[PDB]
Paper text:
In contrast, bacteria utilise the FASII system which involves a series of discrete and functionally specific enzymes that produce fatty acids primarily destined for incorporation into membrane lipids. [name] (3-oxoacyl-[name] or β-ketoacyl-[name] reductase) converts β-ketoacyl-[name] to β-hydroxyacyl-[name] in the presence of NADH or NADPH. [name] enzymes belong to the vast superfamily of SDRs that play a broad number of biological roles in eukaryotes, prokaryotes, and archaea, typically sharing 15–30% sequence identity and ‘fingerprint’ motifs.
For [name], the presence of a basic residue in the Gly motif (TGASRGIG18) suggested preference for NADPH and categorization into the cP1 subfamily. To observe binding mechanisms, we performed co-crystallization with NADPH. Crystals diffracted on the MX1 beamline at the Australian Synchrotron to a resolution of 1.85 Å in the spacegroup P 43 21 2 and the final model displayed good stereochemistry and an overall Rwork and Rfree of 0.16 and 0.19 respectively. Enzyme assays complemented clear preference for NADPH by [name], confirming biological relevance for the NADPH bound structure. Overall, analysis of the [name] sequence, structure, and enzymatic assays, suggests [name] (ABO11256.2) is indeed a functional, and is likely the primary 3-oxoacyl-[name] reductase of [name].
Residue numbers in the entry:
A (entry chain A), C (entry chain A): 1 to 244
B (entry chain B), D (entry chain B): 5 to 187, 193 to 244
Amino acid sequence: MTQERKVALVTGASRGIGAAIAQQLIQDGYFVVGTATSESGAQKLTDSFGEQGAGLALDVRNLDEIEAVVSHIEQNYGPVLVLVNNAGITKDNLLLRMSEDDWDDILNIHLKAVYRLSKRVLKGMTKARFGRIINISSVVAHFANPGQANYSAAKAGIEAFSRSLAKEMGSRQITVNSVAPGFIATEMTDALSEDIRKKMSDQVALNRLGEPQDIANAVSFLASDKAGYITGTVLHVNGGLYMA
Amino acid sequence: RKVALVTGASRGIGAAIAQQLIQDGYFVVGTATSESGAQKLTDSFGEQGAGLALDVRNLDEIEAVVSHIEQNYGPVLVLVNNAGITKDNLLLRMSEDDWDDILNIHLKAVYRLSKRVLKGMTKARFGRIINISSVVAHFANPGQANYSAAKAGIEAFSRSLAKEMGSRQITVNSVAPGFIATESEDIRKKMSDQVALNRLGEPQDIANAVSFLASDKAGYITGTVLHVNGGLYMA
Amino acid sequence: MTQERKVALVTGASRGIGAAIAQQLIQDGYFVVGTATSESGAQKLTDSFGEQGAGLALDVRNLDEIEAVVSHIEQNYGPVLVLVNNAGITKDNLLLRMSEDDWDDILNIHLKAVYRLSKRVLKGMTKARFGRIINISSVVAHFANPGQANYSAAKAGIEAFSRSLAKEMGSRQITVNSVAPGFIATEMTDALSEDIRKKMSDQVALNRLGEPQDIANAVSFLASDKAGYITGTVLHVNGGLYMA
Amino acid sequence: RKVALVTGASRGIGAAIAQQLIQDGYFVVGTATSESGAQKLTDSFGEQGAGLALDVRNLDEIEAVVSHIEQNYGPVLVLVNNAGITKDNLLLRMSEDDWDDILNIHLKAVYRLSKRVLKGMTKARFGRIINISSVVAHFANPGQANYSAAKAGIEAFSRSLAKEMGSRQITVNSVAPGFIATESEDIRKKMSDQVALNRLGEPQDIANAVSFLASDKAGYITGTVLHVNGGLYMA
Ligand SMILES: NC(=O)C1=CN([C@@H]2O[C@H](COP(=O)(O)OP(=O)(O)OC[C@H]3O[C@@H](n4cnc5c(N)ncnc54)[C@H](OP(=O)(O)O)[C@@H]3O)[C@@H](O)[C@H]2O)C=CC1
Ligand SMILES: NC(=O)C1=CN([C@@H]2O[C@H](COP(=O)(O)OP(=O)(O)OC[C@H]3O[C@@H](n4cnc5c(N)ncnc54)[C@H](OP(=O)(O)O)[C@@H]3O)[C@@H](O)[C@H]2O)C=CC1
Ligand SMILES: NC(=O)C1=CN([C@@H]2O[C@H](COP(=O)(O)OP(=O)(O)OC[C@H]3O[C@@H](n4cnc5c(N)ncnc54)[C@H](OP(=O)(O)O)[C@@H]3O)[C@@H](O)[C@H]2O)C=CC1
Ligand SMILES: NC(=O)C1=CN([C@@H]2O[C@H](COP(=O)(O)OP(=O)(O)OC[C@H]3O[C@@H](n4cnc5c(N)ncnc54)[C@H](OP(=O)(O)O)[C@@H]3O)[C@@H](O)[C@H]2O)C=CC1
């Protein structure tokens, strides 16, 4: 077999925003490698992507796994020319109850992972004189939320990292951007009550929660030639929940 | 087709926006300051658009133009405020006329045209207002206090209006171009040296950003500034 | 008589924030000219300031009055070396009901006035190689409020103007800054209900409305030598209502 | 007197902050990475402060130092997180150690020390946490991705904590210095050319900003970044 499409890597593609991003990038014409934290989840991704992608197990907290996954992609499918850092979790707590592990795990899964994966894909993107690094941030990197000091610090750090890397890599036509979702309908919000979803949508100028596909549409735009002169920015997709 | 109105569509950014929105499937009314320019617009757009003369400083012309569009083509459901000029000067040499003309052509025009299209957009429960701003509304440039004030005002206006109209599914956004190629060689290099991507942009880059915002792919984006400056300024 | 103190001009000093600013600048050692829209209001200012200031009538919508007032100050008290643009009103309306006059009056009173007064005091500040221009903005130049498109546009324009002028005048050691108040207790908020003031304070991290003196303290800081390396900024004084 | 804790008070910005807070009426505990540096701090502060050795990378030392202050001087009611270093490199040459050390010394230290002082500030219904950031958290600089990420993270941390602690009248703010004179002549001119005020700043400018934020004159300011950069970067 042959693999002639440009390769996109989407971390945490099992569901919701990550799944929508991965499927959209497939529709756009990429060969998409998506990751999950378990081999079973990776196999589910393989099944969903069919012959235009692949699922791989990855814990983004571990440098050896990051390096092994990117090496596998390079050896089997091609250079990673679109990297979407989407994998994440939250470990919320007011600071007085935020443990060392609460802090470290979130910083490692979000910010350190962005540093490690971006560094690891630079050589191939430089070689191609083409690259897209698209980091999933959050509205709370801008509009502070009590109980999420770790998550907010990590996402804001990601945005500043992205500015630095955009400056370092711009001459090679590699763009580095962040997408900041607002209130997006996921399993989590599905689990909330109707009244609380209404409280949330009342804060949104467009008067509704967003959908994973809205984030996918933003990522797809940034990954395309239609955004070749956009780098070092935050693309806010929050329905007017936060305006800058 | 849905009707888009693009002011100052004669050349450069405006012309690229108008042509892209035609490609996207809109019927595009583009405007120029003269009947001759309007006719050239009509000729380029063919059966997918129309050219009209409009000085955006004049409220009567704004109302006549929008009424004409409503009577002949349909409600204005995409409004792109692109028309503009500069009258640069250090503040000590910036006259009342230099200030007022820039504020009127940019900010007042945005107020007047947005107000005039609200009714049709409200009826349709669909709308795109896309205002052309500038990097200098963020990264200040000596000699452009009037232009900078007007564009920043446009961005704040857009946030307020986005809040007012969001429930009706009308989005209001700004696109802020950086250094875009218009026409000065060693100086060009100075400009490109400030850009992370190490080159000047093209009108089509701005057209692509506007096309994105005007489409269903941006239906959950409102009240934002989309910077298209190659890393010249990073927010 | 003699007038040896540096001269500060505070527009709209009759009450609230402007009155607190004017009195604080007097306490700091300035000779303070404050303005009101009527001769009676100007006389009240003269009475409050005593022999360390003066009250003058000024409608900031009129260039001839601006030029006459600054000329009077220069001829009677000294060059305006601290300018605080505080005068203002609101004319709120959703855009569909916002008239041409609603728009124009607000833009003229806020933004055009800042342009005119700043331009008029530049020569004296340049001559002194010292200057402070301090523009009163608003949190709504950042956090959008429906019904205030004119006021928001004007204050945001003022902030951008201030950046431009800061760049133009920095070599002469003239600083140009804005102070953005949040919810400050004034006659207007006094006229609101207790329940609505509680609704407001609930949005504020510090859980209370501010006081005019908080704004005065910010202006006093920026006008002093303790802020000689601060220019082109917005100093937010809103108790955490809006964080940037 | 109320007790202020200033990390990295040996020289420059930290030393200026510590001396200014002494002048303001605080009892200042300043820290250094060695017992000798701590002794020099003790000597300079005299009867208005004390010097202690502290590596902010080590949680045990943080807890021992704050406990010692509580047992000997009083609750820490002003915390200034100033200690830091740089380990610059383009990302392709930035090692895991270069990244981790900077993140730990800046951001992790801010998390740990802020957490450790919350109880005393909550009891007093008074507190000032003032974190030293940098212009490069806003205006990116090649080679400083780690430093930039850490300082931006500190600013977002500060906003979150300001929301958590505001009801108790504890403010949490950042001060972002620009180009501040430390120690390279024609290059100095390049730096000053980027500054609207056309000169490098001094440590005392940063001390003045911190002194303002730590005082009653800033009791309604929380969750902000106070830029002190002479117009190098305008927000
Ligand atoms: N959800 C929302 O409403 C919002 C989300 N965001 C951000 O967008 C992204 C999407 O969030 P969400 O849609 O909630 O994604 P989900 O929480 O729905 O699923 C998260 C994904 O991350 C993966 N993941 C979790 N921990 C690790 C790890 N240690 N190593 C590798 N992969 C891991 C999971 O793998 P597995 O499937 O095996 O668990 C899963 O694929 C996140 O970065 C989040 O911060 C921002 C704003 C709003
Ligand atoms: N060009 C650039 O590099 C950058 C431009 N921008 C902004 O992008 C937009 C496009 O810039 P640019 O392409 O230079 O366009 P201009 O600002 O030069 O605008 C020219 C167009 O506007 C029309 N126009 C001028 N005055 C009026 C008026 N009073 N009423 C109606 N139409 C008027 C002209 O009509 P006619 O053809 O008849 O003269 C022409 O179609 C502007 O808002 C500009 O400020 C932002 C940053 C960079
Ligand atoms: N009040 C608040 O809570 C907030 C206020 N601000 C801003 O801070 C400033 C203070 O607002 P506020 O405290 O309400 O001041 P007030 O509304 O209490 O009084 C306003 C002052 O402005 C003067 N004024 C009004 N129109 C004119 C005019 N055309 N020419 C000259 N002077 C005029 C009045 O003069 P006279 O006394 O003769 O009427 C009065 O002195 C304003 O710029 C406002 O936008 C921002 C955020 C919150
Ligand atoms: N200096 C400048 O131009 C600018 C600096 N900044 C920031 O302002 C702050 C001050 O900068 P600068 O004056 O250069 O200070 P540094 O970043 O050089 O910090 C030096 C001080 O921190 C101490 N320190 C270093 N490592 C540790 C550690 N692991 N644990 C505890 N203390 C430590 C040093 O102790 P010892 O004396 O024992 O070595 C010394 O007191 C920093 O956060 C800096 O990043 C921001 C922008 C501009």
